[PDB]
Each structure stands twice: as structure tokens, then as C-alpha cells.
Design a protein around this ligand. Structure first.
Ligand SMILES: CO[C@@H]1O[C@H](CO)[C@@H](O[C@@H]2O[C@H](CO)[C@@H](S[C@@H]3O[C@H](CO)[C@@H](O[C@@H]4O[C@H](CO)[C@@H](O)[C@H](O)[C@H]4O)[C@H](O)[C@H]3O)[C@H](O)[C@H]2O)[C@H](O)[C@H]1O
Ligand SMILES: *[C@@H]1O[C@H](CO)[C@@H](O)[C@H](O)[C@H]1NC(C)=O
Ligand SMILES: *[C@@H]1O[C@H](CO)[C@@H](O)[C@H](O)[C@H]1NC(C)=O
Ligand SMILES: *[C@H]1O[C@H](CO)[C@@H](O)[C@H](O)[C@@H]1O
Ligand SMILES: *[C@H]1O[C@H](CO)[C@@H](O)[C@H](O)[C@@H]1O
Ligand SMILES: *[C@H]1O[C@H](CO)[C@@H](O)[C@H](O)[C@@H]1O
Ligand SMILES: *[C@H]1O[C@H](CO)[C@@H](O)[C@H](O)[C@@H]1O
Ligand SMILES: *[C@H]1O[C@H](CO)[C@@H](O)[C@H](O)[C@@H]1O
Ligand SMILES: *[C@H]1O[C@H](CO)[C@@H](O)[C@H](O)[C@@H]1O
Ligand SMILES: *[C@H]1O[C@H](CO)[C@@H](O)[C@H](O)[C@@H]1O
Length: 363
């Protein structure tokens, strides 16, 4: 069993999965040449999280873990990185949810079934340290979007499902980080305490799971970790980067019963600041972005366990095709790169944008 004490990112090396590497090497590289083609090959070596966005994706988790075990037998000392993302009525505030399960149709029961598959894999592979991000774009909606019917009506289901997940996946080789939106979402002073209270309640309600290390921020977003100047779109919010956000909500977590909570922040698309966002709330395939700070535990900051790449750069946020199912108007805005494919599908021009504007640079 891959047990640990303190920062779960220390003493191991994040595994760069074959799934993403295949996308870059087979979907991106054949389209590139020279310096760009060579720089792209390097991107595939940067470890990023594998999303378990459907039940059909679970066999891929075992395969990935099987690969890691093989590597670790040869002294690899690698850790798996996955995202649990299949809540019923998922993305309640989104103008189009791609979730396969729905509350009305036995969604909660199907979610628990999904979690059971995952626990058995983790139990089977207890020898591998597994780092997980728990349900992005879920609890954050319950803080600011209860005005939206779907979100208000998904509350109990979200909390029950999240509870089942954190308790069932509370194992010695596991480290879970609950998604907590980002500075532009829950960072605003007015949302700080309410948000901190909800996360603290999830922790305590789950019997303070030892495997629940803390929270994940900026997942699939573009905020800078420590930028020194407030971009125009953050006007009014003193908390304009992720460092300020975790340092503001951290003590509040402690005030509400959850002490020793740490964080991980996505920087996979935070390399260029300011971004091309015309409005902070614009989240779909944002123009003017690049790969950011590389995954590492050497954060020079007490509260941040590690810089991570959760949302895999190159995989689309949503389609700009207005006739397509699940079309979200946010993906057709002037600050969104178009034309864009279905969410999760490979978006070549975006990968190229990210690679071109990368910092640290790959070229
Ligand atoms: C003004 O504040 C804003 O508030 C709104 C809430 O009303 C926030 O909007 C939300 O932003 C979220 C990101 O910050 C996105 S998440 C979005 O959808 C999913 C979940 O991350 C991602 O797609 C999935 O990607 C996986 C990996 O590529 C795939 O495996 C999977 O198949 C895909 O579905 C996508 O990349 C994300 O962009 C919410 O959708 C949105 O409502 C806003 O952030 C605040 O600023
Ligand atoms: C606590 O866990 C139970 C599990 O049945 C769940 O239904 C409930 O919503 C949770 N409460 C909170 C505040 O998370
Ligand atoms: C922000 O963090 C990165 C990585 O830790 C570091 O290289 C950079 O110097 C930091 N910038 C500031 C202003 O602290
Ligand atoms: C599990 O056990 C190992 C033994 O090496 C420890 O190093 C780890 O901290 C955890 O307690
Ligand atoms: C994980 O693996 C890397 C090699 O890529 C090491 O440098 C690190 O110390 C850890 O063993
Ligand atoms: C490797 O895997 C990626 C992701 O599924 C594919 O897009 C590619 O065609 C290859 O099978
Ligand atoms: C996909 O495959 C190519 C060629 O083998 C690599 O260069 C890249 O790093 C990724 O693994
Ligand atoms: C990307 O996928 C292709 C098949 O579509 C492979 O041939 C290649 O090695 C990489 O895995
Ligand atoms: C890689 O990107 C090129 C565009 O430069 C495409 O033509 C190709 O089909 C692949 O998507
Ligand atoms: C990038 O550079 C590599 C060698 O470093 C080449 O093999 C490739 O063709 C591209 O020019």
C-alpha cells in the first residue's frame, strides 16, 4: 500500500497518462513540423489528470493503474491522477450538461454504482498512490447558483453523492481534493464564508476523512496562481489570483471545523496573463491563453500542496456549433476560440494556441 504523511505529492512522481499522450502524438503532432512538432512532443510528458467523466471510462482507470504498477516495478515510483466527474444532473448551472446520469432517473443510485466500480479499482491497486479531484463544477454552484432551478433541485443529490464518494474512497493510498471553484467564483469576499462553510460541512459530515487532504481550485479555468497585477476583468475583486483565494478561504475552513486543509491549483491553461477574457465569467475555450506553471510540489507556499494540470490542454470545453446538442452560448462569445468541437474532444487550434503562448515555454 502506497501510504503517506503530509503532502501526497512529495515522494512520488505524477504519471503522464497514455490517453493524453496519444491525443498529442496522434492528433496534434502529425499536423505540426519543426520546432512546434518537437515542442508538442514535450507537452505529452507533462503529467495531467485523467477524467473519469463516464462509467465507460473506468476501465481506462484500471489500465492506467496497471501501467503504473508495471513502471513502478522498474523503480518508477509513479502516482495516478484522476478526476471523479459524473454526478447526476451534472453542471446544473451550465446551459447544457453532458452528464450521462440524471436525478429524476435514478441518478443518485447510478452515481453510487459508478463510485463502487472506482473503489474496487483503488482497492485492487492499493499499492499505487492515487490523487483525485472530486467533482469539479458541483459544490461551487450550490454557493452562488441556487437561484437556478436545476441547481437548487440538485442540492441534496450533490451532497449525498459527494458524501458517498469521499467516504467510499477514503483509503490509505488515496488523497482527495474537493473542487472549490476559483478566485473569480468563490474568491469574492461575499462568497468566501458561505463557501468555506459548505466545504467544512462536507468534510465533517463525512467523518473528517483522513484521505480528504483539501481543495482543488481553478480546475479547467485560467486564473493566474500569483500574478502581481489585477487584470481588467477582475475589477472589484481583491482576490484576483489563486494564491490570494486559497489564503483567504483556508483560515475560514479552520474556523468552521476543517483544519489542516491543503490545496492544489490547476495552471494547465494559466501561462498567459492577462488572458483574452472580456468577462471573468467567460470560461469556454478562452482565447489568449497558454500552458502554465508545470506540475510540482515545490510551490514555496505553505497552503499549496502542488501546482497541477487538471484540465488537459487541447481537450475542448464545449462546441461552438449552435445546432449541436449541449451547445452552450458561452462557447460562441467573441473571446472563445472557434470553431470548437464537442466538450472533451480534441481541439487542435487551441492546443496550438496553448503551446504557442506557453510559459514556461516548450519551444
Ligand atoms: C462569474 O463567475 C463565473 O460563474 C460561473 C457559474 O455560473 C462559472 O462557470 C463555470 O465555469 C466552470 C470552469 O470554471 C465550467 S467547468 C467546464 O465544464 C467541464 C467541467 O470542468 C469541462 O469539460 C470536461 O472536460 C473533461 C476534460 O477535458 C472531459 O473529460 C469532459 O468530457 C468534459 O465535459 C470544461 O473543460 C470546463 O470548461 C462550467 O461549465 C461553468 O458553468 C465561471 O467559472 C465563473 O467564473
Ligand atoms: C451528509 O451525508 C448524507 C449521506 O446520506 C447526505 O445525504 C447529506 O446530504 C450530507 N450532508 C451534508 C451537509 O453534506
Ligand atoms: C509565482 O510562482 C512561480 C512558481 O512558484 C515563481 O516562479 C514566480 O517567481 C512567482 N511569482 C511571484 C511574483 O512570486
Ligand atoms: C504508510 O506507511 C509508510 C511506511 O513506509 C509510511 O512511510 C507512510 O508515511 C504511511 O504511514
Ligand atoms: C518520480 O520519478 C521521477 C523521475 O521522472 C523522479 O525524478 C522523482 O524523484 C520520483 O522518483
Ligand atoms: C490514442 O488515444 C487517443 C485518445 O483516446 C486517441 O484519440 C488516438 O486516436 C489513439 O487511439
Ligand atoms: C506521443 O508519441 C510521440 C512519439 O512516440 C512522443 O514524442 C510523445 O511524447 C507522445 O508520447
Ligand atoms: C496515437 O494513435 C495512433 C492510432 O490512431 C497510434 O498509431 C499512435 O502510436 C498513437 O498512439
Ligand atoms: C492537425 O491540424 C491540421 C491543421 O493545421 C489539420 O489539417 C489536421 O487534419 C490535424 O487536425
Ligand atoms: C524538433 O526537433 C527534433 C530534434 O530535437 C526533430 O527531430 C524534429 O524534427 C523537430 O525539428
Amino acid at each position: 500500500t502506497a501510504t503517506y504523511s503530509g503532502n501526497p505529492f512529495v515522494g512520488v512522481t505524477p504519471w503522464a497518462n497514455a490517453y493524453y499522450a496519444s491525443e498529442v502524438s496522434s492528433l496534434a503532432i502529425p499536423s505540426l513540423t519543426g520546432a512546434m512538432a518537437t515542442a508538442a512532443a514535450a507537452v505529452a510528458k507533462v503529467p495531467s489528470f485523467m477524467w473519469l467523466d463516464t462509467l465507460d471510462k473506468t476501465p481506462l482507470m484500471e489500465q492506467t493503474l496497471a501501467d503504473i504498477r508495471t513502471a513502478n516495478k522498474n523503480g518508477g515510483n509513479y502516482a495516478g491522477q484522476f478526476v471523479v466527474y459524473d454526478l447526476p444532473d451534472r453542471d446544473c448551472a451550465a446551459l447544457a450538461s453532458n452528464g450521462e446520469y440524471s436525478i429524476a432517473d435514478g441518478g443518485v443510485a447510478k452515481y453510487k454504482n459508478y463510485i463502487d466500480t472506482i473503489r474496487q479499482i483503488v482497492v485492487e491497486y492499493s499499492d499505487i498512490r492515487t490523487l483525485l479531484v472530486i467533482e469539479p463544477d458541483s459544490l461551487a454552484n450550490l454557493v452562488t447558483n441556487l437561484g437556478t432551478p436545476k441547481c437548487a433541485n440538485a442540492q441534496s443529490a450533490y451532497l449525498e453523492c459527494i458524501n458517498y464518494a469521499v467516504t467510499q474512497l477514503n483509503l490509505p493510498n488515496v488523497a482527495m481534493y474537493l473542487d472549490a471553484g476559483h478566485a473569480g467564483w468563490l474568491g469574492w469576499p461575499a462568497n468566501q464564508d458561505p463557501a468555506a462553510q459548505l466545504f467544512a460541512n462536507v468534510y465533517k459530515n463525512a467523518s473528517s476523512p483522513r484521505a480528504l487532504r483539501g481543495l482543488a481550485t481553478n480546475v479547467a479555468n485560467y486564473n493566474g496562481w500569483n500574478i502581481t497585477s489585477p487584470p481588467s476583468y477582475t475589477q472589484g475583486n481583491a482576490v484576483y489570483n489563486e494564491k490570494l483565494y486559497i489564503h483567504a478561504i483556508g483560515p475560514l475552513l479552520a474556523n468552521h471545523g476543517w483544519s489542516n486543509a491543503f490545496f492544489i491549483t490547476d495552471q494547465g491553461r494559466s501561462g498567459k496573463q492577462p488572458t483574452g477574457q472580456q468577462q471573468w465569467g467567460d470560461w469556454c475555450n478562452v482565447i489568449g491563453t497558454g500552458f502554465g506553471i508545470r506540475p510540482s510540489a515545490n510551490t514555496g507556499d505553505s497552503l499549496l500542496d502542488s501546482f497541477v494540470w487538471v484540465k488537459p490542454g487541447g481537450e475542448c470545453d464545449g462546441t461552438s456549433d449552435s445546432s449541436a446538442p449541449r451547445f452552450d452560448s458561452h462557447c460562441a462569445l467573441p473571446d472563445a476560440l472557434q470553431p470548437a468541437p464537442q466538450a472533451g474532444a480534441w481541439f487542435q487550434a487551441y492546443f496550438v494556441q496553448l503551446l504557442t503562448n506557453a510559459n514556461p515555454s516548450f519551444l
